[PDB]
Design an enzyme around this catalytic site. Structure first.
Site, PDB file in Angstrom:
ATOM      1  N   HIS A  77     -14.307   2.241  -6.582  1.00 34.13           N
ATOM      2  CA  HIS A  77     -12.992   1.991  -6.033  1.00 34.13           C
ATOM      3  C   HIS A  77     -12.849   0.679  -5.258  1.00 34.13           C
ATOM      4  CE1 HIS A  77      -8.962   3.341  -5.452  1.00 34.13           C
ATOM      5  NE2 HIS A  77      -9.044   3.308  -4.137  1.00 34.13           N
ATOM      6  N   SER A  96      -5.225   0.875  -5.157  1.00 34.38           N
ATOM      7  CA  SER A  96      -5.293   2.274  -4.776  1.00 34.38           C
ATOM      8  C   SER A  96      -3.881   2.862  -4.678  1.00 34.38           C
ATOM      9  CB  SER A  96      -6.027   2.346  -3.432  1.00 34.38           C
ATOM     10  OG  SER A  96      -6.429   3.651  -3.118  1.00 34.38           O
ATOM     11  N   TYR A  97      -3.495   3.391  -3.522  1.00 35.81           N
ATOM     12  CA  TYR A  97      -2.143   3.941  -3.411  1.00 35.81           C
ATOM     13  C   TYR A  97      -1.160   2.812  -3.723  1.00 35.81           C
ATOM     14  CZ  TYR A  97       1.499   7.189  -2.001  1.00 35.81           C
ATOM     15  OH  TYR A  97       2.554   8.064  -2.064  1.00 35.81           O
ATOM     16  N   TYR A 135       0.922  -1.123   0.000  1.00 34.09           N
ATOM     17  CA  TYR A 135       0.000   0.000   0.000  1.00 34.09           C
ATOM     18  C   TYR A 135       0.962   1.171   0.000  1.00 34.09           C
ATOM     19  CZ  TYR A 135      -3.534   3.420   0.635  1.00 34.09           C
ATOM     20  OH  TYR A 135      -4.345   4.506   0.398  1.00 34.09           O
ATOM     21  N   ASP A 163     -15.398   4.290 -10.858  1.00 37.77           N
ATOM     22  CA  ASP A 163     -14.622   4.681  -9.678  1.00 37.77           C
ATOM     23  C   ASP A 163     -14.728   6.202  -9.554  1.00 37.77           C
ATOM     24  OD1 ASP A 163     -12.684   5.126  -7.654  1.00 37.77           O
ATOM     25  OD2 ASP A 163     -11.505   3.407  -8.387  1.00 37.77           O
TER      26      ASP A 163
HETATM   27  C1  LIG Z   1      -9.122   8.530   2.830  1.00 38.24           C
HETATM   28  C2  LIG Z   1      -8.551   7.500   1.804  1.00 38.24           C
HETATM   29  C3  LIG Z   1      -7.332   6.777   2.396  1.00 38.24           C
HETATM   30  N1  LIG Z   1      -7.234   5.495   2.787  1.00 38.24           N
HETATM   31  C4  LIG Z   1      -5.954   5.412   3.223  1.00 38.24           C
HETATM   32  C5  LIG Z   1      -5.318   4.189   3.730  1.00 38.24           C
HETATM   33  C6  LIG Z   1      -4.462   4.202   4.866  1.00 38.24           C
HETATM   34  C7  LIG Z   1      -3.829   3.003   5.281  1.00 38.24           C
HETATM   35  C8  LIG Z   1      -4.054   1.804   4.540  1.00 38.24           C
HETATM   36  S1  LIG Z   1      -3.237   0.303   4.982  1.00 38.24           S
HETATM   37  C9  LIG Z   1      -3.945  -0.096   6.562  1.00 38.24           C
HETATM   38  O1  LIG Z   1      -3.635  -0.695   4.005  1.00 38.24           O
HETATM   39  O2  LIG Z   1      -1.848   0.549   5.051  1.00 38.24           O
HETATM   40  C10 LIG Z   1      -4.915   1.791   3.422  1.00 38.24           C
HETATM   41  C11 LIG Z   1      -5.541   2.975   3.024  1.00 38.24           C
HETATM   42  N2  LIG Z   1      -5.285   6.595   3.106  1.00 38.24           N
HETATM   43  O3  LIG Z   1      -6.208   7.508   2.554  1.00 38.24           O
HETATM   44  C12 LIG Z   1      -8.125   8.210   0.490  1.00 38.24           C
HETATM   45  N3  LIG Z   1      -9.033   9.271   0.104  1.00 38.24           N
HETATM   46  C13 LIG Z   1      -8.073   7.259  -0.757  1.00 38.24           C
HETATM   47  O4  LIG Z   1      -9.033   6.530  -1.013  1.00 38.24           O
HETATM   48  N4  LIG Z   1      -6.940   7.291  -1.533  1.00 38.24           N
HETATM   49  C14 LIG Z   1      -6.821   6.470  -2.719  1.00 38.24           C
HETATM   50  C15 LIG Z   1      -5.450   6.771  -3.319  1.00 38.24           C
HETATM   51  C16 LIG Z   1      -4.778   7.816  -2.420  1.00 38.24           C
HETATM   52  C17 LIG Z   1      -5.756   8.130  -1.290  1.00 38.24           C
END
Ligand SMILES: C[C@H](c1nc(-c2ccc(S(C)(=O)=O)cc2)no1)[C@H](N)C(=O)N1CCCC1
Ligand SMILES: *[C@@H]1O[C@H](CO)[C@@H](O[C@@H]2O[C@H](CO)[C@@H](O)[C@H](O)[C@H]2NC(C)=O)[C@H](O)[C@H]1NC(C)=O
Ligand SMILES: *[C@@H]1O[C@H](CO)[C@@H](O[C@@H]2O[C@H](CO)[C@@H](O)[C@H](O)[C@H]2NC(C)=O)[C@H](O)[C@H]1NC(C)=O
Ligand SMILES: *[C@@H]1O[C@H](CO)[C@@H](O[C@@H]2O[C@H](CO)[C@@H](O)[C@H](O)[C@H]2NC(C)=O)[C@H](O)[C@H]1NC(C)=O
Ligand SMILES: *[C@@H]1O[C@H](CO)[C@@H](O[C@@H]2O[C@H](CO)[C@@H](O)[C@H](O)[C@H]2NC(C)=O)[C@H](O)[C@H]1NC(C)=O
Ligand SMILES: *[C@@H]1O[C@H](CO)[C@@H](O[C@@H]2O[C@H](CO)[C@@H](O)[C@H](O)[C@H]2NC(C)=O)[C@H](O)[C@H]1NC(C)=O
Ligand SMILES: *[C@@H]1O[C@H](CO)[C@@H](O[C@@H]2O[C@H](CO)[C@@H](O)[C@H](O)[C@H]2NC(C)=O)[C@H](O)[C@H]1NC(C)=O
Ligand SMILES: *[C@@H]1O[C@H](CO)[C@@H](O[C@H]2O[C@H](CO)[C@@H](O)[C@H](O)[C@H]2NC(C)=O)[C@H](O)[C@H]1NC(C)=O
Ligand SMILES: *[C@@H]1O[C@H](CO)[C@@H](O[C@H]2O[C@H](CO)[C@@H](O)[C@H](O)[C@H]2NC(C)=O)[C@H](O)[C@H]1NC(C)=O
Ligand SMILES: *[C@H]1O[C@H](CO)[C@@H](O[C@@H]2O[C@H](CO)[C@@H](O)[C@H](O)[C@H]2NC(C)=O)[C@H](O)[C@H]1NC(C)=O
Ligand SMILES: C[C@H](c1nc(-c2ccc(S(C)(=O)=O)cc2)no1)[C@H](N)C(=O)N1CCCC1
Ligand SMILES: *[C@@H]1O[C@H](CO)[C@@H](O)[C@H](O)[C@H]1NC(C)=O
Ligand SMILES: *[C@@H]1O[C@H](CO)[C@@H](O)[C@H](O)[C@H]1NC(C)=O
Ligand SMILES: *[C@@H]1O[C@H](CO)[C@@H](O)[C@H](O)[C@H]1NC(C)=O
Ligand SMILES: *[C@@H]1O[C@H](CO)[C@@H](O)[C@H](O)[C@H]1NC(C)=O
Ligand SMILES: *[C@@H]1O[C@H](CO)[C@@H](O)[C@H](O)[C@H]1NC(C)=O
Ligand SMILES: *[C@@H]1O[C@H](CO)[C@@H](O)[C@H](O)[C@H]1NC(C)=O
Ligand code: NA
Lengths: 728, 728
Positions: A702, A592-593, A509, A670
């Site tokens: 998403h 996602s990220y 992530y 998405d």
């Molecule tokens: C608010 C949303 C969010 N979710 C998280 C997060 C934090 C820890 C983790 S883990 C526990 O998997 O490491 C997984 C996800 N950060 O930001 C945020 N708008 C979102 O949906 N994005 C998508 C791409 C960049 C941001």
């Protein structure tokens, strides 16, 4: 001889974790849904009674999605016709059942398509939002009072958040805040008038002849943001003859000079409200503490009671300034903030005093404040054994900070290293929820002497089933990088033999403040990969990860797509050198990220990865929203940080994909990470002649979580990974 | 060992086909581009001269996309800033160059963003469309006369077609027609006010922050169509009146009773125009012949001159009622129509007599009338050797129909069986274009004695190159089904051995009036598959195909997705029964209608095919446009043909796709067969748990013809085919 945890087991949920979701209604009792029946439990003895019969609403007609008993147990709001919107938002229909007269109210009922509803904190008043306007009902069967009249779809939001505020600020659709005893109703108003709209097609069922176009006010990086105003209305002095009067509380001058956000609202007392404002450049926030003036009927926020919170190394707070925890008299409060060493700890503030005093300290962090009494403050931290991926409940004596007691650490050290808690109304009782490394364990305790009253659910049923399965194990450890330790976890296949070479999949992530290496027990895709395909699934928390202090978390400030990407490659590099990893079969995947990082990694030219899968990845920061992107990247202008915005894209690394196998997936609907992001990746790969695998999911968002899509995406990725590793 | 024809050879165009594109500018002179130099040729002797030096427009400061010489040779229209739109439409900038003074006109320049421009048939008058309105210029350097003021983007189209009229009715963008000597200007006006819009995202360059939503008036099956009107303006009066009157010619009462279309406009003389109208139910069309009334300045169409054309077995025309060719005096005309036996032949009409006389007949068909002189009518047909897939030029004597000479049949029968022709201005000369089965051959001929003047291009250069290559061979033959002959062709690998078993790829289109079995020589993907991958690539023309009479063509009337689909399956069976096909490796693929048929075949449960590729397929007829769909399917209403509309979808066969390997591909900006069609196939497959391969092409249209995408898609498809056939 015994079976392994298969893909079908994961997809069909053969092995279910049992939970125990209760709801405190007082300092002594809680509600628990059993056999579709709602029971009330006495915490001291464990005895219960039936609060509401699962049959009571038999001839109701509609399928009830959820219920909500008023604080005084007199009414129950029935929710149905649920229609999901974004991550937290949705509309539904509501009805109210009078528990006293065992009758369903049919007069002056809440409208259909209601966007949000909530009981007052005490008694049974109601506040709901419909067509973007706020309404209040002093009594369930009485006509509601219209509070706002400016409500306008996609333009003016009263009492509910717009898209970005819902997702990146409040993590809720709700923008209403009842004062403690329900006298006052505070609410925010959002204006998205000049916010550009993201537009994309929705195909719907086969029967829809023309695709529909969804339009959502969504400010991308550097774009025009919604503006916000804050109001407070007295619900005790509402008239059926005159339009309610809402008193506005304006943001501080230091905020009004430019774009800003309302980021927190927390009532201190019956007549004192606190609010935190955040500048668009998210490294400076201000807390106002406002008192009701009975004479003028206004709210004044003394400048002397202002509290500034800023950062020189990054943004403020993990994702936003933390919420304050006021004492009974509202004269002082506790709040988590990064100390001078960069670690998040509890600071004790006096409302009209500038310097706060830290009550905890150390190279570890407090995750959250959970409960407060005149003698103790309860909190969760990852202090125990210095494991940043562990969580335990502690209490600290307010009269002597040297006396900190851990309440969960030693309960069952082998099975439980990750807890969350739920306290009763006055913290008289608390429920501990252990979720790892062993099977979830739920327990009830009494605060007076921290007695372990009883086990609510131990998942012994599941444990019995898992005995006949070859389950994978989990290794949690760390590697060093420049005198700094960084944790990782490996889901190891059953009967792990360190003399053999296992292919390895890096589950990533890696977004800011993320943590993918922890002690939490999980049954997911990785479980199957390791149990059936004998693949090792690893995760690593590098620079940018959270709960380890700012030095680590802020390392990627204004620099997304750099260190957190490099550190993943480094970890894999180090894992490939370990004796049990086949350096010819190393893959990486993320959502996602994680999809972004996975893509940046695959296009880095490192040569460490054979293949990778990216699901709904971000591809260039200018496509993502303002509130989250600007938090880490500043503005995309040449005077601010445009250059790094431009060379931190996936697209620019297209050419480097020639030596790897890439599977790119994304849902067409998405609303968060627009399909656009993957559409631009694919076009760039096409432009340099790079072949790759792709899959779009019609109308999925998403989460790509509809039942069929979910099974389909994981089935598809499983084939890809197995093929990449040459597995039967 | 001689090299084979590889995939790279195809994608890189190493073996280039040469052609000879000339432009007649008079009855004995033509223009030809040689080394970016425009040369003029004397047809009778072959000598030439430089008409326009390549270095004439170096200081033009713009790359010229195309040119156009005014009929009288006095000016040249320079086209630049070319911006493609749909299949035929595009926008561009223009400049006029005075050949006499050798200067570039800089006054009263044609506006930028001109949608269409055309010289008058004689002289140098200019008519153009800008912002949906018609303008006329009597002289290149003088002010334009505006003809219409109703022009309105996506709503009112004057002189140009809307989307569906461009694609399905006129196969052109222009909707204006100059009378023979240029005095009158006729034109059509389309109103799409109530036509629904197809909407889809266009992502554009990576620099565009928010995706763009393309919106275009497009009537799907059974939806509200655009309405049309026809007018004629006397351009000779433009300089004498402030606002020249556009006289309208109303459609016949038999068309005004319901929805209809203007389907053909053809001038007969300086003062007589012919129009053909087609009912929304395309099995009835009417031709009016209208004369100018010099005293009333009006246009009248005598019912005594009206001609009716209808069909009992299908629609009218191959794709639309055919065009008439009038004799000089405008008193009679020749038109291709199907006779009592169902074969399309030339009928000679007297303008005021309803019964025409067929001048050709037989179990073969006339493809088109190419030219008409006072003594002879020249036409192309497939009569030669009873080969519906061949094409030759014929000459029939007007004073003696028993005198029919084939001008091209015997010129080189082994190398040339598919001809096309281009006559000079008064048919004094004609260029013959042989396109197969051997290498293309272009020759020039003299009409006075039908003698070959000289060879223009013989492709000797390519013939030389193809010598060191193991090129595949092509077999054109037929199989008998139900006493009817059905043609097919096979691209056979080099050194084809009938004693072996070859994997087979069925290349299909199969839409109504299609022909995939012919004598044309092609260098394409199938060439590489046969030459390098030793794959047999076959095609079959079953029920529904054209040029073989209405019994075959109208067999699928009101029933798309049935016989043409089944016949394609039966064809594969017949091929395997030939003994040289590996029944375990039979694939199928197609683009557009071919994508649909491929999908329907893969989902029929026949067991015959192992895998298949559908590119930009139609999936349900209600998603395609009205004009094309309704032509074969009637209206999608319960009273008409809805049941079959709902019964011929790809989605309803989703479950059968579990028996095959499928690769679905589609361009996201396909304005023709909307991405929507594939989005619904994928969702349906996901809904029944079927795994498949997919690929979307960002911003590509129905042709997926951009250089990078073209290479990318054929590469992706080759891997899939090789994989399915288990080829290295
Ligand atoms: C608010 C949303 C969010 N979710 C998280 C997060 C934090 C820890 C983790 S883990 C526990 O998997 O490491 C997984 C996800 N950060 O930001 C945020 N708008 C979102 O949906 N994005 C998508 C791409 C960049 C941001
Ligand atoms: C909630 O708190 C408010 C504010 O303290 C209470 O309202 C006040 O009550 C006192 C005593 O009756 C009055 O003299 C004040 O004028 C009231 N102030 C306002 C702003 O209304 C209210 O009674 C409390 N509600 C409950 C249920 O206890
Ligand atoms: C908050 O962060 C911003 C962004 O880094 C700081 O603002 C300026 O940042 C640019 C670089 O992008 C520097 O050139 C300036 O010197 C910074 N200061 C100013 C006034 O522009 C800002 O300083 C940070 N605020 C705090 C309290 O750390
Ligand atoms: C092709 O060649 C013919 C024959 O030479 C050219 O005819 C010209 O005829 C005129 C009569 O007015 C003579 O004055 C010229 O001298 C002839 N040309 C030459 C080259 O002798 C004809 O013009 C040529 N056509 C082209 C396009 O080059
Ligand atoms: C194009 O067709 C539309 C009909 O849909 C015409 O619009 C109507 O025009 C009349 C007369 O001006 C109005 O009274 C109606 O209100 C209009 N209807 C609609 C739906 O807009 C339009 O005038 C036509 N345009 C042309 C140039 O003929
Ligand atoms: C030229 O003549 C046409 C047709 O008479 C004029 O168009 C009319 O314009 C009026 C007022 O602008 C409208 O009410 C009519 O509906 C229009 N009719 C048509 C067919 O468009 C046009 O305006 C005239 N141009 C000039 C410069 O006078
Ligand atoms: C093109 O054809 C038109 C129509 O026949 C010609 O215009 C007519 O010319 C005759 C003279 O022969 C006049 O009696 C009429 O008044 C004209 N009619 C109209 C509608 O203009 C025109 O002269 C021809 N043009 C050329 C260059 O021959
Ligand atoms: C749990 O047990 C107690 C008794 O041990 C229940 O009884 C208390 O409340 C009842 C009704 O409110 C009374 O009937 C009892 O007299 C009273 N007893 C005591 C010692 O207070 C209590 O209601 C039970 N709670 C539930 C939820 O069933
Ligand atoms: C919502 O915000 C808009 C935009 O700032 C407010 O209107 C402003 O913008 C309009 C369009 O750009 C201008 O035409 C207006 O002059 C400008 N100011 C006003 C008072 O309209 C709009 O008022 C806001 N609405 C609310 C309820 O706050
Ligand atoms: C929201 O929708 C429901 C369902 O339409 C409304 O309930 C009634 O439903 C019946 C049939 O289901 C209809 O005949 C009525 O028109 C509906 N309204 C009433 C007043 O009976 C419900 O009323 C709607 N919500 C509100 C606030 O009116
Ligand atoms: C006008 C377009 C057309 N083209 C053809 C055609 C005929 C023969 C062949 S061949 C020579 O390959 O057999 C190939 C294509 N039919 O219709 C038609 N609007 C179109 O684009 N559609 C897409 C799906 C259904 C119609
Ligand atoms: C309530 O309903 C469930 C199923 O909805 C049923 O199995 C259960 O027996 C019911 N509860 C009681 C107390 O009967
Ligand atoms: C309340 O305000 C709205 C709009 O501002 C107005 O239309 C309505 O009449 C008002 N109601 C009363 C009771 O004044
Ligand atoms: C220290 O380690 C980091 C990675 O953890 C590396 O990028 C950096 O260059 C090293 N040296 C310094 C001075 O930070
Ligand atoms: C004309 O221009 C073309 C393209 O630049 C060039 O190839 C050719 O050599 C020029 N003409 C001559 C006679 O050289
Ligand atoms: C067309 O556009 C160009 C570019 O702006 C401009 O300079 C030129 O004058 C325009 N030509 C005409 C005929 O308007
Ligand atoms: C045209 O086709 C329709 C639909 O099949 C039919 O009902 C009608 O009779 C046909 N008209 C003619 C003239 O054949
Ligand atoms: Na106990």
């Amino acid at each position: 001889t015994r079976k392994t945890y298969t893909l079908t087991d994961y997809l069909k949920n053969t092995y279910r974790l049992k939970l125990y979701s209760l709801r405190w209604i007082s300092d002594h009792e809680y509600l628990y849904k059993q056999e579709n029946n709602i029971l009330v439990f006495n915490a001291e003895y464990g005895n219960s009674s039936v609060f509401l019969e699962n049959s009571t609403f038999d001839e109701f007609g509609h399928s009830i999605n959820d219920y909500s008993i008023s604080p005084d147990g007199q009414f129950i709001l029935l929710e149905y016709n649920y229609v999901k919107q974004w991550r937290h938002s949705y509309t539904a229909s509501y009805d109210i059942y009078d528990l006293n007269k065992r009758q369903l109210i049919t007069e002056e009922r809440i409208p259909n398509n209601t966007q949000w509803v909530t009981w007052s904190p005490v008694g049974h008043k109601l506040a709901y939002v419909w067509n973007n306007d706020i309404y209040v009902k002093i009594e369930p069967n009485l006509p509601s009072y219209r509070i706002t009249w400016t409500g306008k779809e996609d333009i003016i939001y009263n009492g509910i958040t717009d898209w970005v505020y819902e997702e990146e600020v409040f993590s809720a659709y709700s923008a209403l805040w009842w004062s403690p005893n329900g006298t006052f109703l505070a609410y925010a108003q959002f204006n998205d008038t000049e916010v550009p709209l993201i537009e994309y097609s929705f195909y719907s069922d086969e029967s829809l002849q023309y695709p529909k176009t969804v339009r959502v006010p969504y400010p991308k990086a550097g774009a025009v943001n919604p503006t916000v105003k804050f109001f407070v209305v007295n619900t005790d002095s509402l008239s059926s003859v005159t339009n309610a009067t809402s008193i506005q509380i304006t943001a501080p001058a230091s905020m009004l000079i430019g774009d800003h956000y309302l980021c927190d609202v927390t009532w201190a007392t019956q007549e004192r409200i606190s609010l935190q404002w955040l500048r668009r450049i998210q490294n400076y926030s201000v807390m106002d503490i406002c008192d009701y003036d009975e004479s003028s009927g206004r709210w004044n926020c003394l400048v002397a009671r202002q509290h500034i919170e800023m950062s020189t190394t990054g943004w403020v707070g993990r994702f936003r300034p933390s919420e304050p925890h006021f004492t009974l008299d509202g004269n002082s409060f506790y709040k988590i903030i990064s100390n001078e060493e960069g670690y998040r700890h509890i600071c004790y503030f006096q409302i009209d005093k500038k310097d706060c005093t830290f009550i905890t300290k150390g190279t570890w962090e407090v995750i959250g404040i959970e409960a407060l009494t005149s003698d103790y403050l309860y909190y969760i931290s990852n202090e125990y054994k210095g494991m940043p991926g562990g969580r335990n409940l502690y209490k600290i004596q307010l009269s002597d900070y040297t006396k900190v007691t851990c309440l969960s650490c030693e309960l069952n050290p082998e099975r439980c290293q990750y807890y969350s808690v739920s306290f009763s109304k006055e913290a008289k009782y608390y429920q501990l929820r252990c979720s790892g490394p062993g099977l979830p364990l739920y327990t009830l305790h009494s605060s007076v002497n921290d007695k372990g009253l009883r086990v609510l659910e131990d998942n012994s049923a599941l444990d019995k089933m898992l005995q006949n399965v070859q389950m994978p194990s989990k290794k949690l450890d760390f590697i060093i990088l420049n005198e700094t330790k960084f944790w990782y976890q490996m889901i190891l296949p059953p009967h792990f033999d360190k003399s053999k070479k296992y292919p390895l999949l890096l589950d990533v992530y890696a977004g800011p403040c993320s943590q993918k290496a922890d002690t939490v027990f999980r049954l997911n895709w990785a479980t199957y990969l390791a149990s059936t395909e004998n693949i090792i699934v690893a995760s690593f928390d590098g620079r940018g990860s959270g709960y380890q202090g700012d030095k680590i978390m802020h390392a990627i400030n204004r620099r997304l797509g750099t260190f957190e990407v490099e550190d993943q490659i480094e970890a894999a590099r180090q894992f490939s050198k370990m004796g049990f990893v086949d350096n010819k079969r190393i893959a990486i995947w993320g959502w996602s990220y994680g999809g972004y990082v996975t893509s940046m990694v695959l296009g880095s030219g490192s040569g460490v990865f054979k293949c990778g899968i990216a699901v709904a990845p971000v591809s260039r920061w200018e496509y993502y929203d303002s509130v989250y992107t600007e938090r880490y990247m500043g503005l995309p202008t040449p005077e601010d940080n445009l250059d790094h915005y431009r060379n931190s894209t996936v697209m620019s690394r297209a050419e480097n994909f020639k030596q790897v196998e890439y599977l790119l997936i994304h849902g067409t609907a998405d609303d968060n990470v627009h399909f656009q992001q993957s559409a631009q990746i694919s076009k760039a790969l096409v432009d340099v002649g790079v072949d790759f695998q792709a899959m779009w999911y019609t109308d999925e968002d998403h989460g790509i979580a509809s039942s069929t899509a979910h099974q389909h995406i994981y089935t598809h990725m499983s084939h890809f990974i197995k093929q990449c590793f040459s597995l039967p």
